[PDB]
PDB file of C-alpha atoms in Angstrom:
ATOM      1  CA  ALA A   1       9.123  -0.037  21.039  1.00 45.46           C
ATOM      2  CA  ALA A   2      11.482  -0.886  17.720  1.00 40.48           C
ATOM      3  CA  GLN A   3      14.103  -3.550  17.741  1.00 43.38           C
ATOM      4  CA  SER A   4      17.432  -4.397  16.322  1.00 39.41           C
ATOM      5  CA  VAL A   5      19.511  -7.963  16.131  1.00 40.28           C
ATOM      6  CA  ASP A   6      23.040  -8.739  14.459  1.00 42.34           C
ATOM      7  CA  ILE A   7      23.438 -11.382  12.770  1.00 41.21           C
ATOM      8  CA  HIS A   8      26.441 -12.603  11.769  1.00 43.25           C
ATOM      9  CA  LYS A   9      28.344 -13.210   8.203  1.00 43.28           C
ATOM     10  CA  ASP A  10      26.433 -16.153   6.664  1.00 44.08           C
ATOM     11  CA  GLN A  11      23.954 -16.896   9.196  1.00 45.61           C
ATOM     12  CA  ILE A  12      20.830 -18.180   6.623  1.00 44.81           C
ATOM     13  CA  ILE A  13      18.765 -14.975   8.439  1.00 43.84           C
ATOM     14  CA  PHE A  14      15.278 -17.339   7.115  1.00 41.98           C
ATOM     15  CA  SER A  15      14.440 -19.650   4.194  1.00 38.02           C
ATOM     16  CA  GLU A  16      12.524 -20.629   1.595  1.00 32.42           C
ATOM     17  CA  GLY A  17       8.886 -21.937   3.264  1.00 32.33           C
ATOM     18  CA  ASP A  18       9.509 -20.793   6.672  1.00 33.51           C
ATOM     19  CA  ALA A  19       6.400 -19.278   8.802  1.00 32.47           C
ATOM     20  CA  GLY A  20       6.817 -15.362   8.870  1.00 28.21           C
ATOM     21  CA  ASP A  21       5.730 -12.713  11.034  1.00 26.50           C
ATOM     22  CA  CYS A  22       8.273  -9.472  10.682  1.00 24.46           C
ATOM     23  CA  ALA A  23       9.764  -7.476   7.845  1.00 26.13           C
ATOM     24  CA  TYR A  24      13.511  -6.177   8.483  1.00 26.77           C
ATOM     25  CA  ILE A  25      15.102  -3.298   7.519  1.00 27.04           C
ATOM     26  CA  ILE A  26      18.874  -3.405   7.023  1.00 26.63           C
ATOM     27  CA  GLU A  27      20.880  -0.955   8.941  1.00 23.36           C
ATOM     28  CA  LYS A  28      24.244  -2.199   8.257  1.00 25.12           C
ATOM     29  CA  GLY A  29      25.367  -4.918   5.933  1.00 25.79           C
ATOM     30  CA  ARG A  30      24.104  -6.648   3.298  1.00 25.26           C
ATOM     31  CA  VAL A  31      22.283 -10.091   2.736  1.00 23.74           C
ATOM     32  CA  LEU A  32      21.396 -12.320  -0.673  1.00 24.69           C
ATOM     33  CA  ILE A  33      17.624 -13.106  -1.543  1.00 24.81           C
ATOM     34  CA  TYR A  34      18.253 -16.656  -3.024  1.00 25.19           C
ATOM     35  CA  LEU A  35      16.440 -19.404  -4.125  1.00 28.08           C
ATOM     36  CA  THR A  36      17.519 -22.952  -4.248  1.00 27.14           C
ATOM     37  CA  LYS A  37      16.608 -25.357  -6.767  1.00 27.74           C
ATOM     38  CA  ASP A  38      18.259 -28.827  -7.449  1.00 25.24           C
ATOM     39  CA  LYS A  39      20.895 -28.375  -4.547  1.00 25.80           C
ATOM     40  CA  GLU A  40      21.690 -25.400  -6.540  1.00 24.43           C
ATOM     41  CA  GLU A  41      21.922 -21.282  -5.292  1.00 23.85           C
ATOM     42  CA  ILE A  42      19.893 -19.368  -7.722  1.00 21.56           C
ATOM     43  CA  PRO A  43      20.801 -15.613  -6.564  1.00 16.83           C
ATOM     44  CA  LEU A  44      17.606 -12.935  -7.210  1.00 14.08           C
ATOM     45  CA  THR A  45      18.945  -9.774  -5.463  1.00 19.38           C
ATOM     46  CA  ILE A  46      21.715  -8.240  -2.729  1.00 15.07           C
ATOM     47  CA  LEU A  47      19.977  -5.174  -0.843  1.00 17.14           C
ATOM     48  CA  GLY A  48      22.539  -3.188   1.443  1.00 15.58           C
ATOM     49  CA  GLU A  49      21.559  -0.598   4.188  1.00 17.88           C
ATOM     50  CA  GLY A  50      18.231   1.362   4.015  1.00 16.02           C
ATOM     51  CA  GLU A  51      16.489  -1.278   2.452  1.00 15.24           C
ATOM     52  CA  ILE A  52      13.194  -3.847   3.634  1.00 14.53           C
ATOM     53  CA  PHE A  53      13.180  -7.401   2.640  1.00 15.12           C
ATOM     54  CA  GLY A  54      10.263  -9.871   4.534  1.00 13.88           C
ATOM     55  CA  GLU A  55       7.884  -7.337   3.308  1.00 13.42           C
ATOM     56  CA  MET A  56       5.207 -10.309   2.118  1.00 12.96           C
ATOM     57  CA  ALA A  57       5.021 -11.733   5.809  1.00 14.84           C
ATOM     58  CA  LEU A  58       3.953  -8.258   6.913  1.00 15.88           C
ATOM     59  CA  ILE A  59       1.006  -7.884   4.131  1.00 17.18           C
ATOM     60  CA  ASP A  60      -0.122 -11.561   3.443  1.00 18.20           C
ATOM     61  CA  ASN A  61      -0.392 -14.397   5.559  1.00 17.38           C
ATOM     62  CA  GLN A  62       2.170 -16.816   3.944  1.00 19.68           C
ATOM     63  CA  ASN A  63       5.633 -18.010   4.255  1.00 19.74           C
ATOM     64  CA  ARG A  64       9.259 -16.582   3.127  1.00 19.47           C
ATOM     65  CA  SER A  65       8.771 -16.933  -0.481  1.00 18.13           C
ATOM     66  CA  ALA A  66      12.762 -16.943  -0.654  1.00 19.83           C
ATOM     67  CA  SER A  67      15.796 -17.790   1.480  1.00 20.39           C
ATOM     68  CA  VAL A  68      18.122 -14.584   2.822  1.00 20.43           C
ATOM     69  CA  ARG A  69      21.496 -14.646   3.799  1.00 22.45           C
ATOM     70  CA  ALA A  70      24.063 -12.420   5.402  1.00 22.31           C
ATOM     71  CA  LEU A  71      26.799 -11.714   3.118  1.00 21.17           C
ATOM     72  CA  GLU A  72      28.578 -10.008   5.880  1.00 20.41           C
ATOM     73  CA  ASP A  73      27.749  -9.028   9.326  1.00 19.21           C
ATOM     74  CA  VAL A  74      24.131  -7.464   9.765  1.00 14.66           C
ATOM     75  CA  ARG A  75      22.068  -4.813  11.803  1.00  9.65           C
ATOM     76  CA  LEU A  76      18.534  -5.606  11.028  1.00  6.59           C
ATOM     77  CA  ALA A  77      15.797  -3.425  12.169  1.00  3.68           C
ATOM     78  CA  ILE A  78      12.464  -5.829  12.809  1.00  4.75           C
ATOM     79  CA  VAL A  79       9.447  -4.662  11.820  1.00  4.79           C
ATOM     80  CA  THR A  80       6.528  -5.874  12.792  1.00  2.64           C
ATOM     81  CA  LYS A  81       2.912  -6.012  11.579  1.00  5.96           C
ATOM     82  CA  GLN A  82       1.932  -3.245  15.260  1.00  6.74           C
ATOM     83  CA  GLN A  83       4.586  -1.072  14.153  1.00  7.21           C
ATOM     84  CA  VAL A  84       3.127  -0.904  10.472  1.00  8.37           C
ATOM     85  CA  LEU A  85      -0.210  -0.147  11.735  1.00  6.35           C
ATOM     86  CA  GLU A  86       0.588   2.889  13.909  1.00  4.50           C
ATOM     87  CA  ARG A  87       3.436   4.451  11.423  1.00  6.87           C
ATOM     88  CA  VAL A  88       0.533   4.511   8.804  1.00  5.92           C
ATOM     89  CA  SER A  89      -1.890   5.772  11.386  1.00  5.40           C
ATOM     90  CA  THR A  90       0.423   8.933  11.971  1.00  2.42           C
ATOM     91  CA  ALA A  91       1.419   9.559   8.371  1.00  2.00           C
ATOM     92  CA  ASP A  92      -0.278  12.198   5.703  1.00  2.50           C
ATOM     93  CA  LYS A  93      -3.748  11.899   4.448  1.00  2.49           C
ATOM     94  CA  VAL A  94      -2.588  10.951   1.236  1.00  2.00           C
ATOM     95  CA  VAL A  95      -0.170   8.551   2.200  1.00  2.00           C
ATOM     96  CA  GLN A  96      -2.640   7.003   4.124  1.00  2.00           C
ATOM     97  CA  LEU A  97      -5.620   6.410   1.592  1.00  2.00           C
ATOM     98  CA  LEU A  98      -2.953   5.591  -0.989  1.00  2.00           C
ATOM     99  CA  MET A  99      -1.118   2.728   1.379  1.00  2.00           C
ATOM    100  CA  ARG A 100      -4.457   1.168   2.268  1.00  2.00           C
ATOM    101  CA  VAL A 101      -6.285   0.679  -1.110  1.00  2.00           C
ATOM    102  CA  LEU A 102      -2.201  -0.578  -2.638  1.00  2.00           C
ATOM    103  CA  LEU A 103      -1.611  -2.841   0.555  1.00  2.00           C
ATOM    104  CA  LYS A 104      -5.836  -4.105  -0.545  1.00  2.00           C
ATOM    105  CA  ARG A 105      -4.607  -5.072  -3.957  1.00  2.00           C
ATOM    106  CA  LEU A 106      -1.992  -7.136  -2.765  1.00  2.00           C
ATOM    107  CA  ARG A 107      -3.098  -8.881  -0.120  1.00  2.00           C
ATOM    108  CA  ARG A 108      -5.013 -10.203  -3.670  1.00  2.00           C
TER     109      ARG A 108
ATOM    110  CA  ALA B   1      -1.066  23.989  -5.877  1.00  2.00           C
ATOM    111  CA  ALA B   2      -3.155  21.109  -5.262  1.00  2.00           C
ATOM    112  CA  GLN B   3      -6.517  21.291  -7.546  1.00  2.00           C
ATOM    113  CA  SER B   4     -10.093  20.036  -7.260  1.00  2.00           C
ATOM    114  CA  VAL B   5     -12.350  20.088 -10.129  1.00  2.00           C
ATOM    115  CA  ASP B   6     -15.992  19.624 -10.161  1.00  2.00           C
ATOM    116  CA  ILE B   7     -17.603  17.186 -12.231  1.00  2.00           C
ATOM    117  CA  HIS B   8     -21.334  17.324 -13.280  1.00  2.00           C
ATOM    118  CA  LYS B   9     -23.859  14.401 -12.434  1.00  2.00           C
ATOM    119  CA  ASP B  10     -24.064  11.843 -15.255  1.00  2.00           C
ATOM    120  CA  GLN B  11     -20.344  13.007 -16.902  1.00  2.00           C
ATOM    121  CA  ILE B  12     -18.066   9.958 -17.111  1.00  2.00           C
ATOM    122  CA  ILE B  13     -14.845  10.975 -15.182  1.00  2.00           C
ATOM    123  CA  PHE B  14     -12.988   8.066 -16.977  1.00  2.00           C
ATOM    124  CA  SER B  15     -13.101   5.361 -18.711  1.00  2.00           C
ATOM    125  CA  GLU B  16     -12.880   1.429 -19.693  1.00  2.00           C
ATOM    126  CA  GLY B  17      -9.200   2.106 -21.577  1.00  2.00           C
ATOM    127  CA  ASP B  18      -8.356   5.446 -21.635  1.00  2.00           C
ATOM    128  CA  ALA B  19      -4.748   6.740 -20.241  1.00  2.00           C
ATOM    129  CA  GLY B  20      -4.712   8.061 -16.626  1.00  2.00           C
ATOM    130  CA  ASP B  21      -1.867   9.905 -15.169  1.00  2.00           C
ATOM    131  CA  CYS B  22      -3.787  10.980 -11.758  1.00  2.00           C
ATOM    132  CA  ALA B  23      -5.487   9.342  -9.435  1.00  2.00           C
ATOM    133  CA  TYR B  24      -8.948  11.226  -7.677  1.00  2.00           C
ATOM    134  CA  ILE B  25      -9.780  11.694  -3.955  1.00  2.00           C
ATOM    135  CA  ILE B  26     -13.702  12.464  -3.285  1.00  2.00           C
ATOM    136  CA  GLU B  27     -14.101  15.841  -1.421  1.00  2.00           C
ATOM    137  CA  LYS B  28     -18.096  15.751  -2.385  1.00  2.00           C
ATOM    138  CA  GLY B  29     -20.308  13.575  -3.767  1.00  2.00           C
ATOM    139  CA  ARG B  30     -19.991  10.428  -5.030  1.00  2.00           C
ATOM    140  CA  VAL B  31     -19.105   7.924  -8.583  1.00  2.00           C
ATOM    141  CA  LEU B  32     -20.089   4.526  -9.855  1.00  2.00           C
ATOM    142  CA  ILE B  33     -16.742   2.793 -10.584  1.00  2.00           C
ATOM    143  CA  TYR B  34     -18.565   0.541 -13.488  1.00  2.00           C
ATOM    144  CA  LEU B  35     -17.243  -2.208 -16.171  1.00  2.00           C
ATOM    145  CA  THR B  36     -19.642  -2.828 -19.553  1.00  2.00           C
ATOM    146  CA  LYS B  37     -19.850  -5.836 -21.327  1.00  2.00           C
ATOM    147  CA  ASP B  38     -22.810  -6.045 -24.272  1.00  2.00           C
ATOM    148  CA  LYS B  39     -23.454  -2.559 -24.048  1.00  2.00           C
ATOM    149  CA  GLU B  40     -24.963  -3.366 -20.604  1.00  2.00           C
ATOM    150  CA  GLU B  41     -23.390  -1.472 -17.262  1.00  2.00           C
ATOM    151  CA  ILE B  42     -22.397  -3.624 -14.839  1.00  2.00           C
ATOM    152  CA  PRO B  43     -21.640  -1.811 -11.623  1.00  2.00           C
ATOM    153  CA  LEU B  44     -19.159  -2.225  -9.336  1.00  2.00           C
ATOM    154  CA  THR B  45     -18.785  -0.556  -6.494  1.00  2.00           C
ATOM    155  CA  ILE B  46     -20.164   2.981  -5.154  1.00  2.00           C
ATOM    156  CA  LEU B  47     -17.558   5.051  -3.669  1.00  2.00           C
ATOM    157  CA  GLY B  48     -17.919   8.536  -1.726  1.00  2.00           C
ATOM    158  CA  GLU B  49     -16.305  11.240   0.344  1.00  2.00           C
ATOM    159  CA  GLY B  50     -12.702  10.346   1.328  1.00  2.00           C
ATOM    160  CA  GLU B  51     -12.193   7.542  -0.771  1.00  2.00           C
ATOM    161  CA  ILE B  52      -9.531   8.006  -3.538  1.00  2.00           C
ATOM    162  CA  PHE B  53      -9.902   6.141  -7.373  1.00  2.00           C
ATOM    163  CA  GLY B  54      -7.982   5.864 -10.452  1.00  2.00           C
ATOM    164  CA  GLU B  55      -4.573   5.264  -7.844  1.00  2.00           C
ATOM    165  CA  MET B  56      -3.170   2.334 -10.561  1.00  2.00           C
ATOM    166  CA  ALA B  57      -1.842   5.346 -12.718  1.00  2.00           C
ATOM    167  CA  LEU B  58      -0.380   6.248 -10.208  1.00  2.00           C
ATOM    168  CA  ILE B  59       1.964   3.076 -10.081  1.00  2.00           C
ATOM    169  CA  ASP B  60       2.441   1.664 -13.557  1.00  2.00           C
ATOM    170  CA  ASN B  61       0.782   4.311 -16.352  1.00  2.00           C
ATOM    171  CA  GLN B  62      -1.080   1.263 -17.887  1.00  2.00           C
ATOM    172  CA  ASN B  63      -4.377   2.433 -19.043  1.00  2.00           C
ATOM    173  CA  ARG B  64      -7.917   3.068 -16.517  1.00  2.00           C
ATOM    174  CA  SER B  65      -9.056  -1.339 -15.511  1.00  2.00           C
ATOM    175  CA  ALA B  66     -12.709   0.465 -15.282  1.00  2.00           C
ATOM    176  CA  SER B  67     -14.960   2.903 -16.152  1.00  2.00           C
ATOM    177  CA  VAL B  68     -16.182   5.860 -13.638  1.00  2.00           C
ATOM    178  CA  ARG B  69     -19.329   8.037 -13.992  1.00  2.00           C
ATOM    179  CA  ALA B  70     -20.501  10.482 -11.107  1.00  2.00           C
ATOM    180  CA  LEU B  71     -24.228   9.314  -9.785  1.00  2.00           C
ATOM    181  CA  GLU B  72     -24.361  13.088  -8.515  1.00  2.00           C
ATOM    182  CA  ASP B  73     -22.325  16.470  -8.393  1.00  2.00           C
ATOM    183  CA  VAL B  74     -18.848  15.577  -7.809  1.00  2.00           C
ATOM    184  CA  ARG B  75     -15.597  17.495  -6.328  1.00  2.00           C
ATOM    185  CA  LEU B  76     -12.529  15.480  -6.382  1.00  2.00           C
ATOM    186  CA  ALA B  77      -9.429  16.275  -5.991  1.00  2.00           C
ATOM    187  CA  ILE B  78      -6.326  15.971  -8.384  1.00  2.00           C
ATOM    188  CA  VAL B  79      -3.385  13.664  -7.010  1.00  2.00           C
ATOM    189  CA  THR B  80      -0.086  13.579  -9.101  1.00  2.00           C
ATOM    190  CA  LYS B  81       3.142  11.270  -9.236  1.00  2.00           C
ATOM    191  CA  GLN B  82       4.797  14.594  -7.942  1.00  2.00           C
ATOM    192  CA  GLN B  83       2.521  15.290  -4.794  1.00  2.00           C
ATOM    193  CA  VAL B  84       2.319  11.584  -4.125  1.00  2.00           C
ATOM    194  CA  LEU B  85       6.882  11.687  -3.774  1.00  2.00           C
ATOM    195  CA  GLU B  86       6.928  14.747  -1.745  1.00  2.00           C
ATOM    196  CA  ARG B  87       4.333  13.795   0.763  1.00  2.00           C
ATOM    197  CA  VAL B  88       6.218   9.641   0.564  1.00  2.00           C
ATOM    198  CA  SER B  89       9.986  11.927   0.854  1.00  2.00           C
ATOM    199  CA  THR B  90       8.675  13.387   3.843  1.00  2.00           C
ATOM    200  CA  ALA B  91       7.216  10.689   5.965  1.00  2.00           C
ATOM    201  CA  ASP B  92       8.558   8.176   8.092  1.00  2.00           C
ATOM    202  CA  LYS B  93      11.155   5.461   7.034  1.00  2.00           C
ATOM    203  CA  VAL B  94       8.893   2.775   8.020  1.00  2.00           C
ATOM    204  CA  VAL B  95       5.938   4.093   5.667  1.00  2.00           C
ATOM    205  CA  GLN B  96       8.659   4.787   2.884  1.00  2.00           C
ATOM    206  CA  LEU B  97       9.601   2.075   2.368  1.00  2.00           C
ATOM    207  CA  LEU B  98       6.214   0.428   2.429  1.00  2.00           C
ATOM    208  CA  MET B  99       5.170   2.289  -0.128  1.00  2.00           C
ATOM    209  CA  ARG B 100       7.922   1.665  -2.554  1.00  2.00           C
ATOM    210  CA  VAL B 101       7.711  -1.517  -2.353  1.00  2.00           C
ATOM    211  CA  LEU B 102       3.742  -1.359  -2.967  1.00  2.00           C
ATOM    212  CA  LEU B 103       4.490   0.032  -6.052  1.00  2.00           C
ATOM    213  CA  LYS B 104       7.584  -2.031  -7.566  1.00  2.00           C
ATOM    214  CA  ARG B 105       4.868  -4.985  -6.712  1.00  2.00           C
ATOM    215  CA  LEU B 106       1.861  -3.865  -8.453  1.00  2.00           C
ATOM    216  CA  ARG B 107       3.430  -2.658 -11.347  1.00  2.00           C
TER     217      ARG B 107
END
């Protein structure tokens, strides 16, 4: 059962270093991917509706490489490891094979 | 129109260094992925029916990182950038987004 959550403007959705198991697809609003060094916000990217972030938690098994803050109220679809497996297994044969070898290459 | 090609036993399908625009799915036979150093064949992998290789040509169009020889008569399905785009565009939303970030990261 796919799930969604609301997060309010200016909330940090997650931070550089956090453990994470899931990715997020933006259904509403916008987020800023940023790092921080020195006590200084260094922005990388702004993402809006239809876009995914947090994806490396679904692939590898490390921590968040960047922090993400909501620039406005957001509604996020939670993508889990289980859902990925399920969707990939129902997908087109060629798309399957491609995802599977691309996923392997990205792992390392 | 999807296309296939027959490659005879011992034909080099492509080589380390070649420009390439497509990937292949093996419908028949087997192929050896190899490198060569000092005129010495160093085998990596044997691939057979149902498997894909050459996939990086669909990602970045830099040259082949390994050579591939048919060990026996093969039939390969040609996978083009256009076909991938078409299938990706009909696919599940989550599968779409995922493909798209794999392509982004592996360039």
